[PDB]
Structure 1
Amino acid sequence: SMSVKKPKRDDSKDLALCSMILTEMETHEDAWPFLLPVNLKLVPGYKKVIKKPMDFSTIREKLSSGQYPNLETFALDVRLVFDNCETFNEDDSDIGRAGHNMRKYFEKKWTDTFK
């Protein structure tokens, strides 16, 4: 509350560390469904159904331009990429399996770096 604070966590490396995680996600062999925005002219149903599209290139641009206020807003966009994927793709599909694999990969890096 006013004039009553928990000890200050060092957040000075968060930006660099989120960049490194995002590099590791970009270079994973199962990243290909997530590298670029879904083409809303060419994929029937995507525009109407997926209310907030997100992809790795869009996260990279937000990261590089100071549009994440903290590491939680960064994690929310990464998770949005996988939540969107589950919404649109059957579990038993190449893209459906890609999304589950990448979400696991991300969550372990996130816990190891920050928890």
Structure 2
Amino acid sequence: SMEQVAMELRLTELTRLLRSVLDQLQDKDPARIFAQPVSLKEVPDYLDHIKHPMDFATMRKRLEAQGYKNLHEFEEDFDLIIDNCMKYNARDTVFYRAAVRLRDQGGVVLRQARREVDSIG
């Protein structure tokens, strides 16, 4: 149908905007701490601690399959990255501290994203 196409164009355009959002958030992680999945070879107990692992590469795979229906879904995955880190790692660690800085800096990007998503519809 023509309606299904229009819906698909909307999804494609959301994917475009979320790709730019993802790039801007990942720039706030210049150490690449959150770039890839925590390695279960190197942290064998990880899934005993963290039930839903997340990282920027995993988000990018979902994004490119147009697997984010709305900004809320995308933010859920970004918050997982941060929240998983802040539980597994202690306050006095470079990992925890990286997550705090990512959260604080990402907030600004996500605030305007929400306005753009609502504005453009």
TM-score where L is the length of structure 1: 0.82
- The offset of 1:105, in angstroms, is 1.4
Q: Distance in 1 between matches of 2:19 and 2:61?
A: 11
- The offset of 1:62, in angstroms, is 0.1
8 Å Cα contact 2:29-2:98 kept in structure 1: no
Give per-residue Cα distances to partners, 1:42-66, cap 9 Å, x unaligned. Answer: 1142121100000000000100002
Q: Distance in 2 between matches of 1:76 and 1:105?
A: 16
Change (3 A) 1:24 1:15: same
TM-score where L is the length of structure 2: 0.78
Q: Distance in 2 between matches of 1:83 and 1:28?
A: 16
Name the structure where helix makes up a greater proportion of residues.
2
Percent identity of paired positions between Structure 1 and Structure 2: 32
2:32 matched residue in structure 1? 32
Q: Which amino acid aligns with 2:65?
A: S
Q: Distance in 1 between matches of 2:17 and 2:91?
A: 31
Q: Which amino acid aligns with 2:56?
A: F
Q: Distance in 2 between matches of 1:12 and 1:109?
A: 20
2:23 matched residue in structure 1? 23
- The unaligned stretches of length 5 or more in structure 1 are 1-9
Give per-residue Cα distances to partners, 1:27-56, cap 9 Å, x unaligned. Answer: 335451100000012114212110000000
Q: Distance in 2 between matches of 1:87 and 1:60?
A: 23
- The offset of 1:70, in angstroms, is 1.4
- The unaligned stretches of length 5 or more in structure 2 are 1-9, 116-121
Q: Distance in 1 between matches of 2:109 and 2:13?
A: 15
Q: Once superposed, which parts of structure 1, at least 4 consecutive aligned residues long, lie more than 6 Å away?
A: none
Q: Which amino acid aligns with 2:36?
A: L
Aligned-CA RMSD value: 1.9
Q: Distance in 2 between matches of 1:26 and 1:95?
A: 15
1:71 matched residue in structure 2? 71
